[PDB]
Design a protein that fits this description.
5-stranded antiparallel sheet, 2 helices, globular, UCP028291
């Protein structure tokens, strides 16, 4: 169970987080709080922090494959909501 964190500067983020639980919450456990969107696939996790001007991405996974699968999946969501470039996001190794 390693943990990485991506930080990006986005506006109205909190909505893209709350909209995810309603978006992908079709066959998975998606929690919606005024802080982040929690979506666990079982043997891992993918949380998304979103404030009016900033967004955080944290994943909880026992394996990097999973780990990156989560930290990356989000990097994509920020891209759909921000058309201009491949979301400038700095992803951390996620510790060892």
């Amino acid at each position: 169970m390693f943990r990485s964190t991506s930080h990006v500067r986005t506006e109205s983020a909190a909505r893209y987080v709350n909209r995810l639980c309603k978006h992908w919450g079709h066959k998975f456990e998606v929690e919606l709080t005024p802080e982040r969107g929690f979506i666990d696939f079982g043997d891992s996790n993918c949380e998304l922090l979103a404030h009016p001007d900033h967004v955080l991405m944290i994943l909880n996974s026992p394996d990097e494959d999973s780990l990156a699968h989560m930290q990356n999946v989000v990097a994509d969501h920020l891209q759909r909501m921000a058309n201009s470039e491949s979301l400038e996001i700095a992803w951390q190794p996620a510790e060892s």
